[PDB]
Design a protein around this ligand. Structure first.
Ligand code: ACP
Ligand code: CA
Ligand code: CA
Ligand code: CA
Ligand code: K
Length: 994
């Protein structure tokens, strides 16, 4: 623990007793661990309490059913309701369905949190340190960092601990501290003390805070605090729920449920008025109150029955489920809406290097000049074996291994690769593999240098740890690096200013060593080095060099290329201003060309496939990269973005060609082109923005800081697990896998969630419309009543709970990934689907009324009132308007009513079987494609049998039905509802639209 941004850099080193360049000793690390513990927060636990989660009773349609239960609990406390205990049952036929859905949602939520926590904890965060046991920097688990050690951070990195800055290697250091300070744009740092002890974080301009991101630059620091003492460590618990709101589709279904309240309300108030007449009837003594209280109970029960009380939970669930499924594919969802949004994406923009490609670079080819004689220019080309970062391989010329030191050009070439380089190698002792520290492109040069061994340095007798940077160090010992002009994407090159080492010859000349995109670099060369010699750049020499670059980048290896140059006579340091990055290009002029290196960088295995799937799902894939256009077009071909011969003259563009276009033309180019190359970070963002101007849902995939703006602009930003912390911070999803296949899976999951939300609604609407159609069909046709308040509450508990919820576990449709993407502003409910809600709701309305009627008429066990119903119910007591007074009251027989109640349950459970797929037949999508549904159905049917046959219960709900023959008819009236939808599905299937 050091308490000061306010002590000097010397004082900090001395406090911890550390040598700035070596780092802590093994024993020091031992002590510091003991005294300071591991660099991690304890928390890591809790989050949502079991009870906290349970409270999604907080919704809308749930509060309605909630209150409804209150009243049925209060109407019951007044000793009445119609039948004593039957009124205390009511409040529980209501809560039960709420409790069921609550349990499911809670369970889904728990499993989700878990799966995610599993995936997040999987891959250990690493840091870079200099420690006394190793000359070059090394990577260690971030939790093993202690106060006192020398840490290295560079553009892209998450700052691993609270660090006091020692040394800024770049000309500036910019940092993203939003997570801590709310400071929206990156901020500049220095290494000078900040006197004020009580200084607020924003003024700690010589400190790097754990959890912030290096936006730009490279720095060396010493760790002040770790773990909980960390600036962001103190503030973990605090903060009043920075957790946001809900998803578009969620607010949509929500809004939709909002207006269903209105309608159901009205239909209910209606039911009350429609029946304000039967208020005096003998059934409730005709009391001038007992009649309206009953029908008010009928309306309320009809309401609780009509309201899709489960809709809120099923969204929550399908969501928690998609997150869980994605977690299983090693995708981390940082933002809930991302799966649904991905669901209707029409365009996937994608970075090339490290995203479409593995970013495992190896220098496999190189050249320098050989002869220059007038229009004749010849190169010395070489090949290099070893594909990994291991310093193991050969330099081949003409199939014979050569001693690089033999060629003065290679000596210089390796010198440049070694000095103009912000990366290094670190040998992982446990994995037994050489790993990069820093950027792949640079590390590839490091391993190259080790392979070239141009000064014939003795390395055979070195450990694998030492062997990793041995020849590079040799070069470093030979030239002092005064300073570095950081790589920048406008100039697309990078520089180092160096002086001869021992200062023994303090004027044999200073040099700058330059490396960069070949086109820019070759343009700024005026000389060409030939061995130890120098001759002027000419057309022929340049054409030669460029064409071999073209050859390599377009050939079967699709080589990523770089030019290497030296500035033989650099400006005086004093004439050089380090303040403005924009003057670096001029400093990097009048160059001598030395050579080119060509890098191998294999495409990911799963990409070509994923793209085909996008193509099938109507999804466009665009490659966007800073790399040369040649290599980018070639790669696109290799992975299927472009055909192997496809003309691409106006389907591929460099940033410059794209800028040369009018705005209108740029927008258009984005609609046809699929390869954008040598484009800056601003270009990436613009392209995405253009796609969005066609009101399209755009995804962006990337890994590097040049991608963060586009990543933030897209609808869904997807970062690679292997990429920069900056790219991850700007994303909604992270592929911890680095597996590009997952993107397509996410799309499909998001497509499936929508479809499940759909069938759920279709089931509730078409069914509940039916129930309401019943109450109005009998009351209008002038029949005995079909149902009673509690009977209503029961078809509710049994047809609107788990059978509905279960549809959320529907399997994806057969063609789900073979249609195009749904426009996001598609009316939630199609014009045709509404007719389908009615055709079904109608059969349900008229099948449940026909059942009670059939009992009164065609039913043997029942009376034989025979067609016309004898017409009315004017009889009542003993023989009234005498039209065959053979039976007294019959109506008020539980039988006709229990009958309808059982066609209702049965026929609802029947057309939930229609809700496995929008338009697919039960033929291609059989009932057993969703087992969860079949279980729920059995649960309800069986629950319905209980109520009917367990002796005390039928009294509470109204007496039973002859197993043998009654059911035969219920089942005979109900089964057709499957036949009816199956005609409807066929209609919209055999004729297709949507
Ligand atoms: N460290 C470095 N020093 C010098 N030149 C570099 C460099 N890193 C990259 N370059 C060159 O600059 C060019 C532009 O880099 P930029 O980062 O925009 O793209 P990229 O091609 O490296 C990444 P991607 O394919 O994801 O877009 C690279 O293609 C390469 O030629
Ligand atoms: Ca309901
Ligand atoms: Ca990249
Ligand atoms: Ca229902
Ligand atoms: K975004």
């Amino acid at each position: 623990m050091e308490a000061a941004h306010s002590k000097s850099t010397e004082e900090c080193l001395a406090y911890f007793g550390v040598s700035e360049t070596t780092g802590l000793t093994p024993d020091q690390v031992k002590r510091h661990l003991e005294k300071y513990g591991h660099n991690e927060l304890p928390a890591e636990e809790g989050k949502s309490l079991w009870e906290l989660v349970i409270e999604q009773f907080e919704d809308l349609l749930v509060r309605i059913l909630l209150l409804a239960a209150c009243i049925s609990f209060v109407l019951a406390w007044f000793e009445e309701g119609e039948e004593t205990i039957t009124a205390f049952v009511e409040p529980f036929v209501i809560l039960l369905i709420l409790i069921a859905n609550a349990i499911v949602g809670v369970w889904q939520e728990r499993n989700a949190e878990n799966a995610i926590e599993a995936l997040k904890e999987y891959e250990p965060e690493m840091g870079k340190v200099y420690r006394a046991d190793r000359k070059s920097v090394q990577r260690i688990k971030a939790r093993d960092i202690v106060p006192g050690d020398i840490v290295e951070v560079a553009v892209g990195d998450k700052v691993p601990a609270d660090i006091r800055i020692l040394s800024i290697k770049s000309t500036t250091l910019r940092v993203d501290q939003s997570i801590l300070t709310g400071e929206s744009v990156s901020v500049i740092k220095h290494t000078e003390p900040v006197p004020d002890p009580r200084a607020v974080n924003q003024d700690k301009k010589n400190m790097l805070f754990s959890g912030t991101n290096i936006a730009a630059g490279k720095a060396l620091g010493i760790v002040a605090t770790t773990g909980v003492s960390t600036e962001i460590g103190k503030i973990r618990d605090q903060m009043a729920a920075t957790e946001q709101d809900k998803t578009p589709l969620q607010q949509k279904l929500d809004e939709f449920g909002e207006q269903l309240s209105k309608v159901i309300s009205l239909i209910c108030v209606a039911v009350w008025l429609i029946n304000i007449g039967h208020f005096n009837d003998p059934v409730h003594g005709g009391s001038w109150i007992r009649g309206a209280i009953y029908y008010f109970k009928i309306a309320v029960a009809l309401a609780v029955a009509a309201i899709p009380e489960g809709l809120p939970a099923v969204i929550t669930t399908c969501l928690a489920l998609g997150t869980r499924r994605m977690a299983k594919k090693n995708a981390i969802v940082r933002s809930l809406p991302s799966v649904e949004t991905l669901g209707c994406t029409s365009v996937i923009c994608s970075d090339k290097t490290g995203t479409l490609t593995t970013n495992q670079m190896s220098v496999c080819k190189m050249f320098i000049i050989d002869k220059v004689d007038g229009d004749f220019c010849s190169l010395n080309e070489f090949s290099i074996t070893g594909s990994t970062y291991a310093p193991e391989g050969e330099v081949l010329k003409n199939d014979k291994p050569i001693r690089s030191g033999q060629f003065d050009g290679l000596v210089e070439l390796a010198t440049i690769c070694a000095l103009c380089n912000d990366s290094s190698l670190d040998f992982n002792e446990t994995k037994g593999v050489y790993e990069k520290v820093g950027e792949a492109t640079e590390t590839a040069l490091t391993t190259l240098v080790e392979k070239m061994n141009v000064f014939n340095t003795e390395v055979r007798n070195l450990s694998k740890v030492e062997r990793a940077n041995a020849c590079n160090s040799v070069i470093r010992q030979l030239m002092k690096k005064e300073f570095t002009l950081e790589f920048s994407r406008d100039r697309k090159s990078m520089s180092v200013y160096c002086s001869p080492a021992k200062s023994s010859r303090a004027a044999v000349g200073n040099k700058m060593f330059v490396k960069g995109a070949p086109e820019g670099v070759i343009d700024r060369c005026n000389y060409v080095r030939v061995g130890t010699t120098r001759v002027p750049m000419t057309g022929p020499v340049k054409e030669k060099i460029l064409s071999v670059i073209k050859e390599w980048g377009t050939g079967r290896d699709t080589l990523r290329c770089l030019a290497l140059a030296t500035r033989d006579t650099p400006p005086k340091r004093e004439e050089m201003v380090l303040d403005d990055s924009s003057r670096f290009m001029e400093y990097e002029t009048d160059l001598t060309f030395v050579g080119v290196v060509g890098m191998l960088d294999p495409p990911r295995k799963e990409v070509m496939g994923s793209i085909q799937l996008c193509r099938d799902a109507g999804i466009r894939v665009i490659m966007i990269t800073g790399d040369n256009k040649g290599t980018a077009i070639a790669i696109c071909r290799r992975i299927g973005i472009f055909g192997e011969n496809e003309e691409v003259a106006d389907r591929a563009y460099t940033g410059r060609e794209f800028d040369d276009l009018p705005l209108a033309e740029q927008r258009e180019a984005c609609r046809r082109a699929c390869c954008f190359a040598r484009v800056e970070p601003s270009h990436k963002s613009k392209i995405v923005e253009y796609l969005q101007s066609y009101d399209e849902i755009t995804a962006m995939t990337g890994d590097g800081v040049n991608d963060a703006p586009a990543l933030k602009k897209a609808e869904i930003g997807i970062a690679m697990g292997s990429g920069t912390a900056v790219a991850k911070t700007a994303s909604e999803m992270v592929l911890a896998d680095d597996n590009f296949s997952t993107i397509v899976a996410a799309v499909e999951e998001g497509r499936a969630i929508y479809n499940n939300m759909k069938q759920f609604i279709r089931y509730l609407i078409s069914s509940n419309v039916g129930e309401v159609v019943c109450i109005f069909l009998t009351a209008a046709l002038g029949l005995p009543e079909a149902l009673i308040p509690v009977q209503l509450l029961w078809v509710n508990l049994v047809t609107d709970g788990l059978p509905a919820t279960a549809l959320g576990f529907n399997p994806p449709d057969l063609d789900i990934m073979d249609r195009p993407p749904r426009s996001p502003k598609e009316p939630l409910i199609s014009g045709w689907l509404f007719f389908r809600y009615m055709a079904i709701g109608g059969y349900v309305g008229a099948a449940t009324v026909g059942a009670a009627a059939w009992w009164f008429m065609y039913a043997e066990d029942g009376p034989g009132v025979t067609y016309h119903q004898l017409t009315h119910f004017m009889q009542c007591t003993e023989d009234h308007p005498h039209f065959e007074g053979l039976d007294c009251e019959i109506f008020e027989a539980p039988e006709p009513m229990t009958m309808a109640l059982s066609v209702l349950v049965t026929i609802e459970m029947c057309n939930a079987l229609n809700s496995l797929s929008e338009n697919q037949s039960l033929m291609r999508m059989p009932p057993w494609v969703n087992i969860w549904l079949l279980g729920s159905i059995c649960l309800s049917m069986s629950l319905h049998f209980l109520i009917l046959y367990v002796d005390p219960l039928p009294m509470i709900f109204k007496l039973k039905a002859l197993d043998l023959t009654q059911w035969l008819m219920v089942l005979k009236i109900s089964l057709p509802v499957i036949g009816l939808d199956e005609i409807l599905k066929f209609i919209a299937r055999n004729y297709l639209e949507g």
